[PDB]
Amino acid sequence: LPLDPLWEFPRDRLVLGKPLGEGAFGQVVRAEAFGMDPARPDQASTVAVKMLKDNASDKDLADLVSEMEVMKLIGRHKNIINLLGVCTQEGPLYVIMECAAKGNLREFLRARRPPGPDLSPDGPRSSEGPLSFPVLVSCAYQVARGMQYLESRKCIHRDLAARNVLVTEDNVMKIADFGLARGVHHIDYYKKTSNGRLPVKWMAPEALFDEVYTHQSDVWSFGILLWEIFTLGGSPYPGIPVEELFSLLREGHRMDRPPHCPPELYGLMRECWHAAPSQRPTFKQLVEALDKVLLAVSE
Ligand SMILES: *C(=O)c1nc(NC(=O)Nc2cc(O[C@H](C)c3c(Cl)cncc3Cl)c(C#N)cn2)c(OCCN2CCOCC2)cc1CN1CCN(C)CC1=O
């Protein structure tokens, strides 16, 4: 690969740390970087480094190069994982990105569910869990803002889900793994991940049935993500296996309103799941609708 001086970072300024996770074509590890800001060349920061797995094929390499090029072109936004640099010369290919210290939004919510009524009261806040309604609305608003940014740069996510939203130390939501090669013409719809996820449950019907993806297909997925937020990290279509999911979607089935979810938010979920993609809100409209709720409840 040729040297791009805008982005190239010396690989000897990285100290690789513990792995974070792996995807279809790469693996991600934490690392310390020294001098990511060239004006502070000895300053340490913690970053996430994506690289190829050991068994990597030429297709895996092309997929990682494509992701790097998308990340170069996307530009910076507060509510996405941003590219920090790359290492292409004299060693393995590294794509260096921001690291989100609290992990993904699904894990963040499930770890913060409120105390159950089996716990003995201890102090004045025994009933108060970490999560409050305005903070849940803020998470949703921030995801919508990041998706609005990505849409403005002509980027379609194609698997938007709470596990693909990351959470920083300051509870900033950052959309991850956008614009990736996802093998959309060879999806095993029955595939379950190592954590039990069925990604088919986030697909808009035009994507699942017709292999058509638009920004409005991402809006459908955002509605599933909203349901995940307001169930504190629940898995969608509870109890429904994939074979049953296909038949229910053909019949127009939608998820029920979850407990402790106001009608404003279930209303937005149902708009995001309208059958016709043009009858779903745009991301700009979702940002505005969620901002109105957020402002009302933050007074
Ligand atoms: C660096 O800030 C960091 N990051 C994490 N977790 C993390 O997920 N960071 C992350 C991952 C990531 O992509 C991977 C593939 C991923 C994963 Cl692993 C899971 N779901 C989706 C995705 Cl897409 C990207 C990108 N691009 C960016 N950042 C971290 O963790 C701690 C483990 N913890 C997580 C929360 O629940 C319990 C488990 C830790 C850190 C840095 N820190 C902070 C604190 N110190 C003490 C230890 C540390 O290493």
Atom number, ligand 1, closest to the C-alpha of residue 21: 18
Active-site residue flag, 170: no
List of domains in the chain? 11-98 (3.30.200.20), 105-115+129-297 (1.10.510.10)
Distance of CA 208 to the CA centre of its chain: 19
User: How far apart are alpha carbons 190 and 199 in whole angstroms?
Assistant: 9
Structure solved using which method?
A: X-ray
CA atoms within 13 A on the CB side of 119: 11
Of 59, 75, 77, nearest to 7 by C-alpha is 75
Residue given tokens 């979850």 in the structure block:
258
Cα–Cα distance measured from residue 40 to residue 232, given in angstroms and rounded to the nearest whole number = 40
Three-state secondary structure of the chain = CCCCCCCECCHHHEEEEEEEEECCCCEEEEEEEECCCCCCCCCEEEEEEEECCCCCCHHHHHHHHHHHHHHHHHCCCCCECCEEEEECCCCCCEEEEECCCCCEHHHHHHCCCCCCCCCCCCCCCCCCCCCCHHHHHHHHHHHHHHHHHHHHCCCCCCCCCHHHEEECCCCCEEECCCCCCCCCCCCCCCCCCCCCCCHHHHCCHHHHHHCCCCHHHHHHHHHHHHHHHHCCCCCCCCCCCHHHHHHHHHCCCCCCCCCCCCHHHHHHHHHHCCCCHHHCCCHHHHHHHHHHHHHHHCC
Kindly calculate the radius of gyration of the chain based on its CA atoms and give it in whole angstroms.
20
The CA distance from 283 to 288, in Å, is: 9
Long-range CB pairs of 128-134 (<8 Å, 24+ gap) are 131/232, 133/262, 133/297, 134/294, 134/297, 134/298
Ligand 1 contact, 143 CB (< 6 A): no
- 176 near 74, Cβ under 8 Å? no
CA nearest to 182, candidates 165, 202, 205, 158: 158
Cα distance from N-terminal residue to C-terminal residue, the chain: 53
Closest listed residue to residue 176, CA positions, set 192, 195, 197, 162: 162
Q: How far is C-alpha 58 from the chain's CA centre?
A: 26
Phi-psi region of 123 (alpha: psi -120 to 50; beta: other; left: phi over 0): left
Residues 6+ apart with CB under 8 A from 235: 196, 197, 201
Residue partners of 16: CB distance under 8 A and separation at least 6: 29, 30, 31, 49
Rounded CA separation 98/82 (Å): 6
Name the residue at shortest CA distance from atom 15 of ligand 1.
Answer: 21
Is the beta carbon of 197 within 6 A of some atom in ligand 1?
Answer: no
The residue nearest atom 14 of ligand 1, judged by CA position, is: 21
What length is written for the chain?
A: 299
Supply angle C-alpha 294, 116, 268, rounded to 5: 30
**Torsion angle (degrees, nearest 10) of CA 190, 229, 264, 78:** -110
Q: Does the Cβ of 137 fall within 6 Å of ligand 1? A: no
Pick from 8, 81, 106, 91: nearest CA to 51: 91
Any long-range contacts for 273-279 (C-beta under 8 Å, 24+ apart)? 273/220, 273/223, 275/205, 277/204, 277/206, 277/214, 277/216, 277/217, 277/219, 277/220, 278/216
Q: Are 84 and 91 in contact (CB under 8 A)?
A: no
User: Is the Cα dihedral 282, 74, 204, 23 positive or negative?
Assistant: negative
In short, whether 46's Cβ falls inside 6 Å of ligand 1 is yes
Residue type, 243: E
Joined together, the tokens standing for residue 228 give: 């995940």
Mutate to test the pocket of ligand 1, among 30, 158, 169 (most ligand atoms within 8 A of CB): 30
